[PDB]
């Protein structure tokens, strides 16, 4: 019994091939975590926010590649906090096919730090904890090669960082964390 949401970064810095690689990664995850009470939802964010499929929409078409293929890149700046709030308030809502007593999981995939966001992580993270949202974060590339940047990852993800934070050099290396991610979701389903 699980409701697995994806909040994918579609900001300008992510080149088309890398956005394609991420979609490929999202698809593969959904295919590997395929269970009879496991629903998936996706929202793309940048400075604009787009729901690509609700849990209800996935229930009526449980084909991962059919739902991920049409996803087009938004481009623009990075407003992660506003994205997290929108996932919590919109994706994890009963009207959008979300289940009341199901496990609330969120995999966040980004290539950079949030900037110029109207919202702070303090305005978004407590609400996610209170709503019982288990957060996983994948920080891609050089943007997370500092101490300050890794703390942003730790802020997004659920405590402890060792069990919820992931880091890859690029989008072509997302394939590397495919197995590790699937196994972490399966540990307390």
């Amino acid at each position, epitope marked *: 019994d699980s409701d697995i949401a994806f909040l994918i970064d579609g*900001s*300008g*810095s992510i*080149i088309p091939h890398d956005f394609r690689r991420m979609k490929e990664f999202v698809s593969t995850v959904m295919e590997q975590l395929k269970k009879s009470k496991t629903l998936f939802s996706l929202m793309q964010y*940048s*400075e*604009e926010f*787009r729901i690509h499929f609700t849990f209800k929409e996935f229930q009526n078409n449980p084909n991962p590649r059919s739902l991920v293929k049409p996803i*087009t890149q*938004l*481009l*623009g*700046r*990075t407003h992660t906090a506003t994205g997290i709030r929108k996932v919590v308030r919109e994706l994890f809502n009963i009207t959008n096919g979300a289940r009341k007593n199901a496990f609330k999981i969120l995999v966040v995939i980004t*290539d*950079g*730090e949030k*900037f*110029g*966001d*109207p919202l702070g992580y303090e305005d978004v993270i407590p609400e996610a904890d209170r709503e019982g949202v288990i957060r996983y974060v994948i920080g891609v590339g050089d*943007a997370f090669r*500092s101490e*300050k*940047s890794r703390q942003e990852l730790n802020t997004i993800a659920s405590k402890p960082p060792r069990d919820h934070v992931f880091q890859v050099n690029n989008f072509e290396a997302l394939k590397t964390i495919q197995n590790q991610l699937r196994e972490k979701i399966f540990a307390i389903e």
Partner: antibody, heavy 122, light 114 residues
């Protein structure tokens, strides 16, 4: 050659509405963020809002909330600005500018239109 | 809203001189992930529309002469015109494109001295 072509001068009565257009020759509105900037006589530049013509998503400055409505028409490759309940404060030159997508998280306004004069008078 | 503070509002200039304008933002414009300053400079010649001069605080736009130079980081930014030409007499605006609302400075009008 590559430029933003704006609609002609406007003379409107107060309380009325006006719809300004901006058509780029050389590029697609789908591939840019179309901005709208206000310039009051011998005053500075004042950002109104912008549109993503690829998905019709808009952002405004709350000072223009209720006043301005930015729309896009991909078919005619035109972006629009509608100003409602016109007052003498809306008398200004309105520019359309495009913020291009060059592989970065955001950009500057690299292209600007010639401007459109709006005069509000009874 | 980020405040863009330009100085001086008006500047007396002679042909051949080196001139400098100031633009100070109330908030940081340096994005840590790309190490780029979300600051642009526009030149507005009389009767004409603003034109992009400098972006990323220091990159010159295509066709912009070597005489226009952009410097600064984070909060305090400066535009430099080494050997001023008559064609350079205009209003120079600075703009932040970091967060919404996108804000502009009040400008620096270059006038010829006598």
């Amino acid at each position: 050659q590559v430029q933003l072509q704006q609609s002609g001068a406007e003379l409107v009565k107060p309380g009325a509405s006006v719809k300004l257009s901006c058509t780029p020759s050389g590029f697609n509105i789908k591939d840019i963020y179309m901005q709208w900037v206000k310039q009051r006589p011998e005053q500075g530049l004042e950002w109104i809002g912008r549109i993503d013509p690829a998905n019709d998503k808009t952002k405004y400055d709350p000072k223009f909330q209720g006043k301005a409505t930015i729309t896009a028409d991909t078919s005619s490759n035109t972006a629009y600005l509608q100003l409602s309940s016109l007052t003498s404060e809306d008398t200004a030159v309105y520019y359309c500018a495009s913020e291009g997508h060059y592989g970065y998280d955001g950009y500057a306004m690299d292209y600007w239109g010639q401007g459109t004069t709006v005069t509000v008078s009874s | 809203d980020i405040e863009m503070t330009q100085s001086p509002s008006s500047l007396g200039v002679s042909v051949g001189e080196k001139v400098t304008m100031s633009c100070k933002s109330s908030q940081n414009l340096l994005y840590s992930s790309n190490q780029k300053n979300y600051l642009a400079w526009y030149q507005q010649k009389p009767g004409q529309s603003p034109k992009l001069l400098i972006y990323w605080a220091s990159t010159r736009e295509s066709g912009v002469p070597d005489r226009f130079t952009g410097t600064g980081s984070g909060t305090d930014f400066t535009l430099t015109i080494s050997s001023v030409k008559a064609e350079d007499l205009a209003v120079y605006y600075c703009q932040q494109y970091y967060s919404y609302p996108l804000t502009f400075g009040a400008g620096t009008k270059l006038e010829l001295k006598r």
